[PDB]
Amino acid sequence: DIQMTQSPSSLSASVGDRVTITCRASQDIPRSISGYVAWYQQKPGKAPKLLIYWGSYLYSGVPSRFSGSGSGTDFTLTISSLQPEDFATYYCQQHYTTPPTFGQGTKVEIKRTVAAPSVFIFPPSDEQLKSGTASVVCLLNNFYPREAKVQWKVDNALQSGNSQESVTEQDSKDSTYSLSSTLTLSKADYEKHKVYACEVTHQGLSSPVTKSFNRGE
Amino acid sequence: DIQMTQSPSSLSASVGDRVTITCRASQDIPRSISGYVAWYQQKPGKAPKLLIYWGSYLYSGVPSRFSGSGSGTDFTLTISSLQPEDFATYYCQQHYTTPPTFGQGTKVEIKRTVAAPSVFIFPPSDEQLKSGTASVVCLLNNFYPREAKVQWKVDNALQSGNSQESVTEQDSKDSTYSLSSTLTLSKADYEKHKVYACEVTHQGLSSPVTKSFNRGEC
Amino acid sequence: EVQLVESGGGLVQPGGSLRLSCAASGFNIKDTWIHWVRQAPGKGLEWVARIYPTNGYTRYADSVKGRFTISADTSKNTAYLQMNSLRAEDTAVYYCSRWGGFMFYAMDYWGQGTLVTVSSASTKGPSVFPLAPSGGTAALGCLVKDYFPEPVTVSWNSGALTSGVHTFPAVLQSSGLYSLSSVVTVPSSSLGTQTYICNVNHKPSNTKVDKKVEPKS
Amino acid sequence: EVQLVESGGGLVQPGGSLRLSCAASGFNIKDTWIHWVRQAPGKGLEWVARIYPTNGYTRYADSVKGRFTISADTSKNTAYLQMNSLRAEDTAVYYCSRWGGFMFYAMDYWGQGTLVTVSSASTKGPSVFPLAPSSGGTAALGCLVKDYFPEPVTVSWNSGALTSGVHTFPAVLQSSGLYSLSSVVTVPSSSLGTQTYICNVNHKPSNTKVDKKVEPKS
Ligand SMILES: [Cl-]
Numbered sequence: 018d019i020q021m022t023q024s025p026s027s028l029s030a031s032v033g034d035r036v037t038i039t040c041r042a043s044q045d046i047p048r049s050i051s052g053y054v055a056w057y058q059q060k061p062g063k064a065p066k067l068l069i070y071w072g073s074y075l076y077s078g079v080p081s082r083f084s085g086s087g088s089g090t091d092f093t094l095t096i097s098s099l100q101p102e103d104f105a106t107y108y109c110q111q112h113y114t115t116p117p118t119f120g121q122g123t124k125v126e127i128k129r130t131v132a133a134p135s136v137f138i139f140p141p142s143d144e145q146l147k148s149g150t151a152s153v154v155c156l157l158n159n160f161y162p163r164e165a166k167v168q169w170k171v172d173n174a175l176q177s178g179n180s181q182e183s184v185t186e187q188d189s190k191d192s193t194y195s196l197s198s199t200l201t202l203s204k205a206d207y208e209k210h211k212v213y214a215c216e217v218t219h220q221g222l223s224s225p226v227t228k229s230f231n232r233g234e
Numbered sequence: 235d236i237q238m239t240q241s242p243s244s245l246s247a248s249v250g251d252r253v254t255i256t257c258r259a260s261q262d263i264p265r266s267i268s269g270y271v272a273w274y275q276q277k278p279g280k281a282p283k284l285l286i287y288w289g290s291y292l293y294s295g296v297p298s299r300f301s302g303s304g305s306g307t308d309f310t311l312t313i314s315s316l317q318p319e320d321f322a323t324y325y326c327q328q329h330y331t332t333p334p335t336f337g338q339g340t341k342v343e344i345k346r347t348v349a350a351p352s353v354f355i356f357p358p359s360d361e362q363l364k365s366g367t368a369s370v371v372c373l374l375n376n377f378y379p380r381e382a383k384v385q386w387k388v389d390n391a392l393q394s395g396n397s398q399e400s401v402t403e404q405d406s407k408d409s410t411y412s413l414s415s416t417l418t419l420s421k422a423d424y425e426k427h428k429v430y431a432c433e434v435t436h437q438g439l440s441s442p443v444t445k446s447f448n449r450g451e452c
Numbered sequence: 453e454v455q456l457v458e459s460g461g462g463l464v465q466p467g468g469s470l471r472l473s474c475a476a477s478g479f480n481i482k483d484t485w486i487h488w489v490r491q492a493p494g495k496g497l498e499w500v501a502r503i504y505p506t507n508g509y510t511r512y513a514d515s516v517k518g519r520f521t522i523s524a525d526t527s528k529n530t531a532y533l534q535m536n537s538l539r540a541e542d543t544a545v546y547y548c549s550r551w552g553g554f555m556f557y558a559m560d561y562w563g564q565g566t567l568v569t570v571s572s573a574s575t576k577g578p579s580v581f582p583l584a585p586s587g588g589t590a591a592l593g594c595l596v597k598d599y600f601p602e603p604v605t606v607s608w609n610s611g612a613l614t615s616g617v618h619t620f621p622a623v624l625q626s627s628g629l630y631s632l633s634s635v636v637t638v639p640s641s642s643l644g645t646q647t648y649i650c651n652v653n654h655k656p657s658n659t660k661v662d663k664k665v666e667p668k669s
Numbered sequence: 670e671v672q673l674v675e676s677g678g679g680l681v682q683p684g685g686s687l688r689l690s691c692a693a694s695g696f697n698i699k700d701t702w703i704h705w706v707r708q709a710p711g712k713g714l715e716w717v718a719r720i721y722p723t724n725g726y727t728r729y730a731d732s733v734k735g736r737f738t739i740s741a742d743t744s745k746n747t748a749y750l751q752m753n754s755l756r757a758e759d760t761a762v763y764y765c766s767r768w769g770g771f772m773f774y775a776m777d778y779w780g781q782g783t784l785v786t787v788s789s790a791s792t793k794g795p796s797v798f799p800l801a802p803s804s805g806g807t808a809a810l811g812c813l814v815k816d817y818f819p820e821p822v823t824v825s826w827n828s829g830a831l832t833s834g835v836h837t838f839p840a841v842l843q844s845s846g847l848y849s850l851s852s853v854v855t856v857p858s859s860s861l862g863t864q865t866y867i868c869n870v871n872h873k874p875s876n877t878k879v880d881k882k883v884e885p886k887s
C-alpha cells in the first residue's frame with residue numbers, strides 16, 4: 018500500500034558533520050490525511066529509541082542536535098553535528114495507515130582516523146582439549162577501518178576453510194572495531210603440530226603482524 | 235476531498251421501530267486507512283452526546299438499543315427499538331482526515347397517533363396598543379403531525395404576508411408539537427376593524443376550526 | 453464531575469475580535485486534547501480547531517485559519533479560542549470538547565456552548581406583554597417582543613410551573629429584532645386564585661422582567 | 670521507572686505455538702495502548718499488533734493475521750502475544766512498546782526484546798572455556814562460549830563490575846548447526862596477579878549458568 022521509502026540505506030560521515038536522512042511516502046496522499054511521522058534510533062543489541070514525533074517534535078531528553086521536518090509527503094531527520102555515539106540504524110515510521118509502517122532503515126557509520134589493531138593469540142585450553150576439540154583464537158582489538166585480513170598458519174601450512182571470524186559493531190565512544198578469528202582443529206591435529214601463527218594485515222600497520230605460540234611452551 | 239454523506243437526511247418512525255441511518259464516504263479510500271467513525275446525538279438546545287465510537291463501540295452509559303457497524307466505506311447507526319426520547323439530530327464523524335468532518339445530520343422524528351390541536355386566540359394587550367403596535371396571537375397546542383395551516387382574517391379579509399409562525403421542537407415524552415401564529419398590525423389598523431379570526435386546518439380535525447374575537451368585547 | 457464550561461460569547465461587530473474560554477474540571481487538560489466545534493443557527497456541526505495542550509500542537513479548519521487561534525493554559529486548566537476578523541458567517545454557538553482516556557477520535561464530554569453573534573445591530577432589551585386567558589383548561593402567556601441579540605430565557609412562577617409550558621423559538625422580524633412567546637395551559641378553575649408570573653431574562657441587555665398575567669377585567 | 674519486560678521467548682518447532690508476555694510497571698496499561706514489533710535477524714522493524722487494553726480493541730499486520738493474537742490483562746498490568754502456526758520467517762526479536770500521555774503514534778518506551786527461534790533443532794547448552802592471559806602493559810583475556818543452540822547467550826564480567834575494555838562478539842553459526850562466541854577484555858598486565866576475572870555466562874534456553882574464573886596458565 019502506502020509505504021515509506023527511506024534513503025540512503027547507509028552513509029558515513031565524520032564527527033561534527035551534518036547528516037540528513039530522508040523518508041518519502043511511496044505514493045501520493047491527499048494533504049487532508051496526516052502521517053504523524055516518527056523517527057527512531059536503534060543501537061546494536063538494543064530496542065529502538067524515539068527521537069522525533071509528529072514530524073518535527075523532539076522527544077523529551079533527546080539531544081537538540083536531532084531534528085525533523087516534513088513537507089508534502091517528504092520527511093527528513095537531521096543530525097546537525099554527528100557524534101560517535103550516534104552510530105546506529107535510524108528508522109522512520111508513517112501513520113497514514115493502520116497498521117503504521119516503518120522505513121527500511123539507514124545505517125549511519127562514523128568515519129575516523131586510521132587505528133592499527135592490537136593483536137593477541139590464544140591457545141586452546143587444556144579443558145577444551147579433554148573434550149577432543151581445539152580452538153585457537155586470534156583477537157584484533159580496537160582498529161579502523163574495518164577491512165583486515167587474518168591468515169592462520171600451522172607449522173607453516175596455510176589454513177583455509179577452517180576458521181570463522183566475528184566482528185564487533187563500531188564502538189560508540191572511539192568508533193573502532195574488534196575482530197576474532199577462531200581456528201578449529203581436532204585434538205589429534207593440534208597435537209601433531211608445533212607452531213601456531215596468526216598473521217594480520219591492516220592499513221594501520223606498515224607490514225603484517227604475526228602472533229604465534231608453540232604448543233606446550 | 236473526503237466527506238461523509240448521511241442518509242436519509244430525515245425520517246419518522248414509530249416507537250418500537252428499528253431505525254438505521256447510513257453514513258458513506260464521498261470517495262473510495264484504501265482499507266489501509268482507518269476512519270474511526272463516531273456517532274453523536276444532538277437534542278434541541280443541547281451539546282451533542284457521543285453514542286458510538288470507532289465504528290461500533292458503545293460509549294459508556296449509552297442505551298444498548300444503539301449500535302453501529304461498518305463495511306468498507308459505509309457505516310450504519312441502528313436504533314433497535316426507537317423511544318420517544320430519541321427525537322434528535324444524529325451526526326456521524328470521520329477521522330480519515332485531519333480535520334475530521336461531520337456528516338450533514340439526520341433528523342429523527344417520532345411518528346405517533348394523530349392528535350388535534352387545541353386552539354386559542356389572544357388579542358393585543360392594552361399595554362402594547364400604547365406602543366403603536368398590535369400583535370394578535372393564535373396558539374395551536376399539543377398536536378401531531380407537525381403539518382398545520384393557519385389562516386388569518388380581519389373583517390373577512392385574508393391576511394397574507396403580515397404573520398410569522400414558530401413551532402416547538404417535538405416533545406421528548408408525548409411526541410407532540412405546538413405552534414404560534416403571530417399577526418402584526420399597526421395600532422391604527424387594528425382599531426379600524428372588528429372581527430379577528432384564525433382558522434386552523436390540521437389532519438386531526440375533520441374540518442377547519444376557527445377561533446375569533448371581536449375587538450373591544452370580553 | 454468531568455465538566456467543561458465555555459464563556460466569553462456575545463455580540464461583536466463585523467471585523468472585531470473575541471476570545472472564548474473553556475474552563476475544565478474533573479480532569480486536567482494536560483492529560484488530553486481539547487477541541488472547538490461550532491454550529492450556525494439551524495445548521496450542522498462544523499469542526500473548528502484542536503490543541504494538545506502539553507506541547508501546543510494545533511490544527512484548524514480551513515474556514516478559520518489565519519483568523520482563529522486556539523491556545524491553552526495548563527496551570528489554569530483552561531483553553532481559549534481567540535477569534536479575529538469576525539464575519540457574519542462566524543455567527544454560531546461554539547462548543548469546546550475533549551477526548552478522554554487514550555480514546556482518540558471520540559468527543560466524549562462537551563461544554564454547554566456559548567453564542568457568538570457577529571452583527572452591526574445594537575443590543576436591545578425586549579418588551580413583555582401578557583397573553584391574557586379568557587372546569588376545563590385555559591391557555592395564557594407572555595409575548596416577549598423586539599429584542600436583540602439572542603437569547604432570552606422565560607420561566608413561569610420562578611421555576612415552580614413547568615408542566616404544560618411551551619416557550620417558542622424566537623423569530624426574526626423584518627425589523628431586524630427577535631420576538632417570541634411563552635405559553636402555558638392551566639386548569640380554568642385556577643384562574644381566580646392562582647398567580648401566574650412569567651420571568652423573562654435577556655442577559656445581553658441586562659433586562660429582567662417579571663410579568664403577572666391575569667384575566668382582563 | 671516506566672518499564673516493559675518481555676518473557677516467553679525461546680525455541681519452538683515449526684508449526685508450534687508460543688505466548689509472549691509483556692509486564693509493565695511505572696504506568697498502567699489501562700491508560701494507554703500496547704504494541705508488538707518484531708525484527709528478524711539482521712533486518713528491519715516490522716510492526717505486528719496493537720491493543721487498547723481498556724476495551725480490548727486490536728489490530729494486526731496482514732503477515733500475522735489469523736495466527737497471532739494480542740491480548741491483555743489489566744489486573745496484572747500485562748499484555749500478551751499468542752503466536753500459533755509459527756514458521757521460519759517468524760524467527761525474530763519481539764519487542765513490546767507503548768504510547769505515553771495522550772501522544773498517539775509515538776512508541777516512547779520499549780522493552781528489551783525477546784528472541785523467538787523457530788527451528789526443528791534441539792536445545793544444546795554451551796561449554797565455557799578460558800582464553801587465558803598469556804601488548805605493552807595491557808593483557809587480553811576471555812571466555813570461549815562454545816556449541817550452543819539456539820541464541821542467545823549473555824556474558825558479563827565480574828558480575829557487571831567490569832565493563833571497560835570488554836568486547837562480546839556476535840555469535841557465529843558453525844557447520845555443526847551450533848553457535849559459538851567469545852567475550853574478551855583488555856586489562857592491566859600488573860593486575861593479573863591480584864585481580865580476579867570471572868566471566869558470567871548465561872544460556873537461558875538450556876538453563877545453563879556458568880561463572881568461569883580466567884587466569885594465567887601454570
Ligand atoms: Cl474528534
Ligand SMILES: [Cl-]
Nearest residue numbers: 117774775776
Ligand atoms: Cl506507533
Ligand code: NA
Nearest residue numbers: 440441442443
Ligand atoms: Na366545519
